[PDB]
Amino acid sequence: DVSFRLSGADPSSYGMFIKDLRNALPHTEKVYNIPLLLPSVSGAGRYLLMHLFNYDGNTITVAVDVTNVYIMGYLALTTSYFFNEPAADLASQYVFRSARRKITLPYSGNYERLQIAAGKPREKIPIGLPALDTAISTLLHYDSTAAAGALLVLIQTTAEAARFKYIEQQIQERAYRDEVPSSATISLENSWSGLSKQIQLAQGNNGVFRTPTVLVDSKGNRVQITNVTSNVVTSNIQLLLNTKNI
Ligand SMILES: *[C@@H]1O[C@H](CO)[C@@H](O)[C@H](O)[C@H]1NC(C)=O
Ligand SMILES: O=c1cc[nH]c(=O)[nH]1
User: Fold this and answer.
1) Would the CB of 70 count as within 6 Å of ligand 2?
2) Is the CB of 226 under 6 A from ligand 1?
3) Which CATH class for the 163-246 domain?
4) Whose CA is nearest to atom 12 of ligand 1?
5) Nearest atom, ligand 2, residue 72 CA
6) CA angle 230-235-239, nearest 5°?
7) Residue 226 is inside which H or E element, if any?
């Protein structure tokens, strides 16, 4: 299991938590020196528990599908919660079995469905380590409308940062001031599937992307990713969703 304590957290202990997280995710092979997530993992081994502790030391435990880095569900004290989706329901029969009651949330775990429940797109939702602390607190006591917004902040402060250095870095400067995510930070949230695909198709294409990926850069300028020699591939991206899943 991997852990992260928001009490006395610095951009350092956050980096370390994000490091742990990446290494919790199995892979036999690297593609252009980037871990290749497995096609599938049979049973409870499919899921990763994250123990998170808000500032006042209350905790929740977030289960993550390791083939794709998706949040499936989490546990608050003695109540488990899983999204409204078949993988989550699947995920539910391996983890938090000891929860007194299990609650299916009223949405599947994708940004579109999450953003509607919350009533705002994630471009207007501050994120950072405080907004993570909040999240943890919000989900401690059920409120589906609130828990939407708080899951958009948990997904991003965890899954996305682990996936991408840049975003991890965007979270470390938001160590003490939340802030809405940069336009690029979103681009990369939305392009993960694409990049995981193209980086893998470049294996027998001489490092060229069968289909270029359109991004936004740090500056707010739209740009195209045609090849593995782009900084995004060499520097940024830390994990690849197996094409056996796209
Ligand atoms: C590769 O990408 C770099 C940086 O984006 C660019 O300068 C170059 O024209 C591209 N080369 C190939 C072979 O795709
Ligand atoms: O939509 C997404 C993308 C990544 N991780 C999630 O939990 N949901």
Assistant:
1) yes
2) yes
3) few secondary structures
4) 227
5) 7
6) 105
7) strand 222-227
